[PDB]
Write a structure and sequence with these properties.
The protein is an alpha+beta fold and 274 residues long. It has 10 helices and 10 strands. The protein folds into 2 domains: 82 residues, Phosphorylase Kinase, domain 1, CATH 3.30.200.20; 186 residues, Transferase(Phosphotransferase) domain 1 (Transferase(Phosphotransferase), domain 1), CATH 1.10.510. Strands 1-2-3-5-4 form a 5-stranded antiparallel sheet. Strands 6-8-9 form a 3-stranded antiparallel sheet. A two-stranded antiparallel ribbon has the order 7-10. It starts with 6 loop residues before the first helix and ends in a 5-residue tail after the last helix. Bound molecules: ligand 05B. The ligand O=C1NCC2(CCNCC2)c2[nH]c(-c3ccnc(-c4ccc5c(c4)OCO5)n3)cc21 binds next to strand 1 and strand 3. Keywords: Acetylation, ATP-binding, Cytoplasm, Disease variant, Kinase, Nucleotide-binding, Nucleus, Phosphoprotein, Serine/threonine-protein kinase, Transferase.
């Protein structure tokens, strides 16, 4: 079902970029029939590019997953290309929105984790491990208060049809993202004062269960969603965290935390390590 006629018959392309994947640059575009601003990911054809589109297609109705609108197979400067047209996520990255504020609460963190959990729940019950869940891939649909948090970039995704191992990498990501959400800095562990002094014990113990060095002891997604901090997120205490202040104060090496997490996730994807 890829459209084989030229993308620019349906879309007006901008010379204006919204970032790079591992498979593809992301550009802004406008649907020619309607107003709509959308995002275009350019992949050069290849087995991987094909699996990326396949995996993202399957995931694209699910909760808190960036939706694809259309896929094109085109020639571009004489190379085959696949073009994934996605809804525009103009709210930008999760941890940038948290920065732009000056209170961020433990309850709001459990609501965000539950949303990402429901993405991972959808993917794993469909036997898809994402394997690159990290800040840059967690985007909001708009800058408004009712914006929806969604996961994107299925470039490293594997259809677990090892399986169990690949899913456990997503679960580690959830523990890393949660840790950062609760204090403003990553586990590269411990929970130091005063940033972790008021964090509830349920939160700490769920992170502990998620960052187990042994993958087989790590919580499953269904055990994550049934944990009281996630399952009873409405009633998590409304306590002010120091996350947004710390992110503002540490903004000058936010790029290093992202590089580190990218590197840890690449290392989890190797066939033989250590
Ligand atoms: O698969 C993707 N990989 C690359 C990135 C994430 C890592 N950082 C560079 C871009 C990415 N971004 C998107 C994407 C999809 C839809 N919308 C947007 C988007 C659109 C408008 C935006 C925006 C993000 O940030 C604020 O304005 N990005 C997909 C991908």
């Amino acid at each position: 079902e890829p459209k084989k006629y030229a993308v620019t018959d349906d879309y007006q392309l901008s010379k204006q970029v919204l970032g790079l994947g591992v498979n593809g640059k992301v550009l802004e575009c406008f649907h020619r029939r309607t107003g709509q601003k959308c995002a275009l990911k350019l992949l050069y054809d290849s087995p991987k590019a094909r699996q990326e589109v396949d995996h993202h297609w399957q995931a694209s109705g699910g909760p808190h997953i960036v939706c694809i609108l259309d896929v094109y197979e085109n020639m571009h400067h004489g190379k085959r290309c696949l073009l994934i047209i996605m809804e525009c996520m103009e709210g930008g990255e999760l941890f940038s929105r948290i920065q732009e504020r000056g209170a961020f609460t433990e309850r709001e963190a459990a609501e965000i984790m539950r949303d990402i959990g429901t993405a991972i729940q959808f993917l794993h019950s469909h036997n898809i491990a994402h394997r690159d869940v990290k800040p840059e891939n967690l985007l909001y649909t708009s800058k408004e208060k009712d914006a929806v948090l969604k996961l994107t970039d299925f470039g490293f995704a594997k259809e677990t049809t090892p399986e169990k191992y690949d899913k456990s990498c997503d679960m580690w990501s959830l523990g890393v993202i949660m840790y950062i959400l609760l204090c403003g800095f990553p586990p590269f562990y411990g929970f130091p004062n005063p940033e972790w002094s008021e964090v509830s014990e349920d939160a700490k113990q769920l992170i502990r269960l998620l960052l187990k060095t042994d993958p087989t002891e790590r919580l499953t997604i269904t055990q994550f969603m049934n944990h009281p901090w996630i399952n009873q997120s409405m009633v998590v205490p409304q306590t002010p965290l120091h996350t947004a202040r710390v992110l503002q104060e540490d903004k000058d090496h936010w790029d290093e935390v992202k590089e580190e997490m990218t590197s840890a996730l690449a290392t989890m994807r190797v066939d033989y390590d250590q």
